Amino acid sequence: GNPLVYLDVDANGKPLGRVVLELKADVVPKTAENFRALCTGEKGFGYKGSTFHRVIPSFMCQAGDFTNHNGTGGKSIYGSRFPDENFTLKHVGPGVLSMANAGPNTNGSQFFICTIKTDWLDGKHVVFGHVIEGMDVVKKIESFGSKSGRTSKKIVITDCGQLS
Numbered sequence: 331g332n333p334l335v336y337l338d339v340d341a342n343g344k345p346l347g348r349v350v351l352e353l354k355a356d357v358v359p360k361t362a363e364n365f366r367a368l369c370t371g372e373k374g375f376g377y378k379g380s381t382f383h384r385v386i387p388s389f390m391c392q393a394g395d396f397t398n399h400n401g402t403g404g405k406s407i408y409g410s411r412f413p414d415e416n417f418t419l420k421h422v423g424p425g426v427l428s429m430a431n432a433g434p435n436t437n438g439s440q441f442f443i444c445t446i447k448t449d450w451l452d453g454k455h456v457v458f459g460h461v462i463e464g465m466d467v468v469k470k471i472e473s474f475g476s477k478s479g480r481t482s483k484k485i486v487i488t489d490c491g492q493l494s
């Protein structure tokens with residue numbers, strides 16, 4: 331089956347709650363496996379202690395740069411970048427989980443959770459799952475963003491892992 335993973339997020343050191351994500355290993359196994367392992371930390375690195383560094387209301391919440399903490403870094407469990415697996419899944423609406431990139435075949439660890447339908451990203455960013463629960467926590471993170479993407483509170487993934 332598909333993995334269920336979680337992110338526990340804080341804003342300025344106080345808990346916002348948990349976001350539970352389904353990872354679509356049935357469609358994008360390599361992409362789902364990268365995110366799953368970065369949530370557990372089983373390769374020796376991952377999302378624990380890293381931030382949502384760019385959050386744009388009415389668009390998306392972006393995170394995953396655990397090496398530079400500024401949108402320029404992150405790495406995959408395979409190496410510094412890996413290919414676009416496929417574009418089968420689309421950015422159909424809020425709750426879509428998708429990979430950030432710096433052009434074709436540059437997936438690392440950065441990702442975003444959509445708060446609207448971002449269909450203009452179809453065929454350019456690999457969608458690999460969706461929010462199962464905690465969309466209210468995603469909307470709390472969204473509220474601390476701005477049109478520039480700069481956050482008004484430090485938004486940290488304090489813990490993360492796999493539920494099943």
Ligand SMILES: O=C(NCCc1ccc2c(c1)[C@H]1C[C@@H](N2)[C@H](O)CO1)C(=O)NC1CCCC1
Nearest residue numbers: 401402403410411430431432436437438440442
């Ligand atoms: O902000 C976005 N992309 C630029 C930052 C970025 C993303 C991934 C990676 C890198 C840099 C680094 C490290 C690694 N992976 C590769 O080696 C390439 O260089 C990005 O897609 N936002 C999304 C949010 C909604 C619109 C699109």
